[PDB]
């Protein structure tokens, strides 16, 4: 018995795995990759019913989106991509699908050992983003 509300709270990055390779796959330039690779974002996740809000905060940039689960919406990512996106909660994991310019990326968010595991995949390049509850 798992629900999207299990992901709510305030989270802080504690481990990164393959993030540079994921940014390279997005085409992010060297300057922003150096900036991105030193950030330790803080994330606040809230979900009232099906209305979900994720606000990501760091010393470099603050980003946030609000959406209804299962309903598509437009999101401008931290690296500047204007994407068509939908979020679905399925099998104890929040699934975010991003499309832009004929390219796809999937971002999954799930709890593992109490840590929020964020997996970003694009063109078979997998990035793992580990957050601790604060
Ligand atoms: O970083 C992440 O784990 C992340 C995971 C999934 C989706 C977006 C992410 N990143 C993000 O939303 N932001 C906002 C500001 C900032 C600065 C530096 C690196 C990242 C970010
Ligand atoms: Cl996140």
Numbering used by the authors: 1 to 134
Give the published text.
Based on epidemiological studies and animal knockout models, the isoforms FABP4 and FABP5 were identified as potential diabetes and atherosclerosis targets. The aim of this study was to develop a dual FABP4/5 inhibitor and, to this end, high-throughput and fragment screens were conducted with X-ray crystallography as a follow-up method on those ligands that showed appreciable affinity and favorable physicochemical properties. Structure-based drug design (SBDD) based on initial hits from high-throughput and fragment screens yielded 216 ligand-bound structures of human FABP3, FABP4 and FABP5 isoforms, many of which were at resolutions of better than 1.2 Å.
However, a surprisingly large number of the ligands deviated from expectations. Next to possible human error (mis-labeling), prominent sources of deviations from expectation include side reactions of compounds, such as additions, eliminations, isomerizations, cyclizations and dimerizations.
